[PDB]
Design a protein around this ligand. Structure first.
Ligand SMILES: [Mg+2]
Ligand SMILES: [Mg+2]
Ligand SMILES: [Mg+2]
Ligand SMILES: [Mg+2]
Ligand SMILES: [Mg+2]
Ligand SMILES: [Mg+2]
Ligand SMILES: [Mg+2]
Ligand SMILES: [Mg+2]
Ligand SMILES: [Mg+2]
Ligand SMILES: [Mg+2]
Ligand SMILES: [Mg+2]
Ligand SMILES: [Mg+2]
Ligand SMILES: [Mg+2]
Ligand SMILES: [Mg+2]
Ligand SMILES: [Mg+2]
Ligand SMILES: [Mg+2]
Ligand SMILES: [Mg+2]
Ligand SMILES: [Mg+2]
Ligand SMILES: [Mg+2]
Ligand SMILES: [Mg+2]
Ligand SMILES: [Mg+2]
Ligand SMILES: [Mg+2]
Ligand SMILES: [Mg+2]
Ligand SMILES: [Mg+2]
Ligand SMILES: [Mg+2]
Ligand SMILES: [Mg+2]
Ligand SMILES: [Mg+2]
Ligand SMILES: [Mg+2]
Ligand SMILES: [Mg+2]
Ligand SMILES: [Mg+2]
Ligand SMILES: [Mg+2]
Ligand SMILES: [Mg+2]
Lengths: 96, 242, 173
RNA sequence: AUUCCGGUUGAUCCUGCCGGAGGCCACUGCUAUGGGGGUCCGACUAAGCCAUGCGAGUCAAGGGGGCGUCCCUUCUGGGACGCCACCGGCGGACGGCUCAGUAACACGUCGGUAACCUACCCUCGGGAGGGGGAUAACCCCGGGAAACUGGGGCUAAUCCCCCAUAGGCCUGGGGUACUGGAAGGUCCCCAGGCCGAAAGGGAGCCGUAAGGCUCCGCCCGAGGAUGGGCCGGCGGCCGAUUAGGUAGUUGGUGGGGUAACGGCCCACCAAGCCGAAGAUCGGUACGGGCCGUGAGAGCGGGAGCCCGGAGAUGGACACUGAGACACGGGUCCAGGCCCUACGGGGCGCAGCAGGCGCGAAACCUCCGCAAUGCGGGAAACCGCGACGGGGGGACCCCCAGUGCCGUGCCUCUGGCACGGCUUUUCCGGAGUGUAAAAAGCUCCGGGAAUAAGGGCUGGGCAAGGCCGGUGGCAGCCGCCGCGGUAAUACCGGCGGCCCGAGUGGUGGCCACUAUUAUUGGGCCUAAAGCGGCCGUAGCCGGGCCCGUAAGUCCCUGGCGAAAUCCCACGGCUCAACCGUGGG
């Protein structure tokens, strides 16, 4: 898979950066969240503990997928802002 | 409403001046009573969430508001139902930006970027004027607010004049009269968002409102209601307008 | 009153058994390998609507009429149904055969990607054809002129290999 | 597509009605592979009756308590921490459901209120001084079959009550500061009265303390905002085998009452008020945006979504509150029904599911507050059958499948035999998707495998002059017409035609229909000119000159919500659908 960064925007009020990206992958399954996160943190030099993937979406007859992720500068701000379900679904925390 | 006030608002019945997707959901925010009226303002949640995009959901928009990050006319506003209207200034100091709320050529509300210096002043059209106890004068403005002046000043203010006010201190610094040759900006009606100079003023019997003729820059003359014509300068604008 | 109801996009014949119309429509159905009458009727309706807009715009005048007049011409040349220097009167000489030639099934057969109309339909339905980098599985899709020449085999298809047995038989024609 | 075709005679041309051919809606026979989108599903009969669960809460930063884990000392305690209920505050008048009543200022539209109310919110100008009081919780004792409910003890508040000041309202006499088109309005000065505020409360730090420094709060006045009340002009059904109707009726004067104007209600004085341009009475019905159909002019409908109105088994009437004479609050009568230890006590799903009854006619007693919003809270948050997510259903619309290619043979359309190909769909897996699941989407392994019906076959009207039965019997027939032993028309076989995941039957509206006629019909002989004439209203009215500007034409201000309709561009693979602009 080949990843292309479309936009990186700064949100100082929330204290995060919001990242939109595309993945090109003809003849392959939709990439997993773990692989995308590893590639993204390598590509941008992020602490992976505060990197959350909002979504990965595939389309009808396409060889590429579109994705959205967020990166917080502070762990406590992430736990205070983000909903519980997305942090569990991303393996950041454990479901009780 | 069979027995009491309405507290809800369907999206399909929302005001026509908002930028809102009318079929995406069932409900819209019912704005709280406040400064402007329903036809000339919009709740602050749509500014934070829908217009600027600083938040994705209502819950995190409320957390941004409660921490005190948004200023309206120089004052902290935390209520997500607060109405924001024509000629207000929206300020974000943590990002250092400022906007003036103004209507479109189609009659919809938009945000016009301005300088930091110009953000200190708000023009206020004089809607009504009255005597008050102690024999003083109360001025009632277009955004619902009020000011007091002494009886010696009674000849320097009349209805339809504009007062430039320093906010949030609320101190007068200039009075702009309504007369021929003044510069005006239209705020409602078919000719909304057009601007120019005053040529003539006409009156009628039995309480029908009075009408004004205005010459634009390219030299065309058009008419509108007098109360739709908002004075903004002497012969040049005193604020930045698109 | 009553809320909106979604309406059919095609019109049915005023009489089901007229000999001349039956013969004409049977010839068209055989030639373009359409699946049923309603499909054909759909395209007929499209043509009628075009003509009805031209008839109304000829007898109109004013400012919105001109904008509509140029929009109709622009759309017709974007679909490839008129040349670049056509005028409004040319709208009234369009035939049903002009529209059917723009079907993705027909265009796939015309370019030589299949040997027969039926094979072109199966190639489209099974997902072997890409249009400007996108896979589309509707044989009735009307192809714009600007994307007509970027129509190929899908890059993940078995047919995207010049040594495939079925592709060589297609090329032998 | 601005359309015709069959039927009155031995044969002909007319008038005229019936039938055929199209679209949409409700019930229904037979038959069904996949997906997507949407404002679809107990409205028609019964606004009939309802078992069970759920559909409205929230605040510990308003206040005294109960109990638990720990820290300092503890005889005793003080702290911190975390649950419980109670007092107290705000909300419960919105949202949701249905269309019974109503022919009316109910609704649409333009205006008015100088004749009015408004808790929550915004701005500005000011204020927070002094006193008193009970009571829930808690402990003692209880009653009653239960629903409920009694006496004694003790206690706090942002609970309750007083005093003062500010303030408010009425009337009389002056002055003219304001708005407005116009002052029974606003402002200033005297005078006689009546009504009459407030919580400096709470939380956190700097405080050795003294006191600051923030946040959330309390009361009065002026204006706005928000939500309403009231009024006027204009507009939109059927009946004369309903012609006269009204007597607080219509107006006036003087009062009462109301938030407020008003015969809204009284006392007194007059005779008015409506009506053949259809009063009154009777019939039917919630109004509009819109929807079906038609070349258009028109004709028909107004369940589903939005805005307005009304109702909570039928008929009456009140308490609290800013707002109700209140669907999940109170009272009486009427009519059903449930529990009783027989003394008594309770209940109406036209909320979501679910049951019975009625009928031709309509679904799961599921999951979630993650999104959109509402109420409460300083906030993090909490609740919500609203809303969101799925389950059932030939609801509507959009896009597909039930194979493809080559070479041979046949009756050459299509069927069969060989050789090869593909995997939409199907079966089993990984990822993504989701609040969690399911669908959907990207990949991998298997394999043409897993997938066609309904109606019709004499003319109208596309399609057989073939075969076997029956024999005016049975049967068919929208209409015209078939069947009486040699039936192209009934029943069946084989063929053929139309449409196709659909295709037929029954009932309704529009078209057909210039069989309702303004556009646009008829009345000598076919339905149809009053037996004749005079004249009231109404409609229709001769030529010229001058004036006006109501009708009429042109230009320009303020309006006629959104959704729905047409066009271009853009986002879901295209489309249906959704967004941005123009109309
Ligand atoms: Mg006025
Ligand atoms: Mg209705
Ligand atoms: Mg005869
Ligand atoms: Mg007929
Ligand atoms: Mg019922
Ligand atoms: Mg209630
Ligand atoms: Mg209610
Ligand atoms: Mg009546
Ligand atoms: Mg009215
Ligand atoms: Mg009327
Ligand atoms: Mg007092
Ligand atoms: Mg009076
Ligand atoms: Mg009714
Ligand atoms: Mg009606
Ligand atoms: Mg319904
Ligand atoms: Mg009932
Ligand atoms: Mg049904
Ligand atoms: Mg049910
Ligand atoms: Mg709050
Ligand atoms: Mg024939
Ligand atoms: Mg029949
Ligand atoms: Mg025979
Ligand atoms: Mg037969
Ligand atoms: Mg006739
Ligand atoms: Mg006669
Ligand atoms: Mg006469
Ligand atoms: Mg004359
Ligand atoms: Mg005129
Ligand atoms: Mg509209
Ligand atoms: Mg696209
Ligand atoms: Mg498109
Ligand atoms: Mg739209």
């Amino acid at each position: 898979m080949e990843i292309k960064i479309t936009e990186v925007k700064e949100n100082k009020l929330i204290g995060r950066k919001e990242i939109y990206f595309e993945i090109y992958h003809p003849g392959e399954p939709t990439p997993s969240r773990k692989d995308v996160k590893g590639k993204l943190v390598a590509m941008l030099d992020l602490n992976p503990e505060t990197t959350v993937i909002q979504y990965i979406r595939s389309y009808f007859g396409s060889y590429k997928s579109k994705g959205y992720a967020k990166y917080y500068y502070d762990k406590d701000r992430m736990l205070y802002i983000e909903p519980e379900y997305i942090l569990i679904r991303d393996g950041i925390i454990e479901k009780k | 409403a069979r027995k009491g006030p309405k507290r809800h608002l369907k999206r399909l019945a929302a005001p026509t001046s908002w930028y809102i997707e009318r079929k995406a959901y069932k409900w819209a925010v019912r704005p709280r009573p406040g400064p402007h009226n329903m036809r000339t303002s919009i709740p602050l949640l749509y500014i934070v969430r829908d217009y600027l995009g600083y938040a994705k959901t209502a819950r995190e928009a409320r957390k941004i508001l409660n921490e005190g990050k948004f200023l309206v006319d120089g004052r902290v506003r935390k209520d997500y139902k607060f109405p924001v209207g024509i000629m207000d200034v929206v300020s974000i100091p943590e990002t250092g930006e400022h906007y003036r709320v103004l209507p479109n050529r189609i009659g919809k509300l938009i945000l016009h970027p301005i300088s930091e210096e110009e953000a200190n002043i708000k023009p206020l059209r004089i809607r009504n004027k009255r005597m008050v106890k102690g024999a003083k004068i109360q001025l009632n403005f277009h955004d619902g607010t009020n000011h007091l002046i002494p009886l010696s000043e009674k000849d320097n203010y009349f209805t339809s004049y504009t007062v430039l006010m320093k906010v949030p201190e609320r101190e007068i610094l200039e009075v702009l009269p309504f007369e021929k040759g003044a510069y005006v900006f239209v705020t409602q009606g078919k000719n909304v968002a057009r601007k120019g100079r005053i040529v003539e003023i006409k009156k009628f019997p039995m309480g029908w409102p009075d009408v004004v003729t205005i010459e634009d820059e390219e030299g065309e003359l058009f008419d509108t209601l007098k109360e739709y014509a908002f004075v903004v300068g002497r012969d040049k604008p005193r604020i930045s307008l698109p | 009153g009553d809320p909106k109801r979604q309406r059919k996009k095609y019109e049915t014949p005023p009489h089901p058994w007229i000999k001349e119309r039956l013969d004409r429509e049977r010839v068209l159905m055989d030639k373009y390998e359409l699946k049923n009458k309603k499909e054909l009727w759909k395209h007929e309706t499209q043509l009628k609507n075009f003509r009805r807009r031209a008839r109304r715009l000829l007898a109109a005048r004013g400012k919105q009429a001109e904008i509509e007049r140029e929009q109709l011409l622009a759309r017709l040349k974007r679909l490839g149904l008129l040349p670049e220097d056509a005028v409004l009167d040319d709208v009234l000489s369009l035939t049903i055969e002009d529209i059917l030639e723009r079907r993705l099934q027909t265009i796939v057969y015309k370019k030589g990607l299949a040997r027969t109309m039926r094979q072109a339909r199966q190639l489209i339905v099974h997902g072997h054809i890409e249009v400007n980098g996108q896979i589309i599985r509707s044989p009735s899709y009307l192809v714009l002129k600007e994307e007509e020449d970027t129509i190929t085999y899908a890059r993940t298809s078995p047919f995207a290999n010049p040594q495939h047995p079925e592709r060589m038989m297609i090329e032998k024609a």
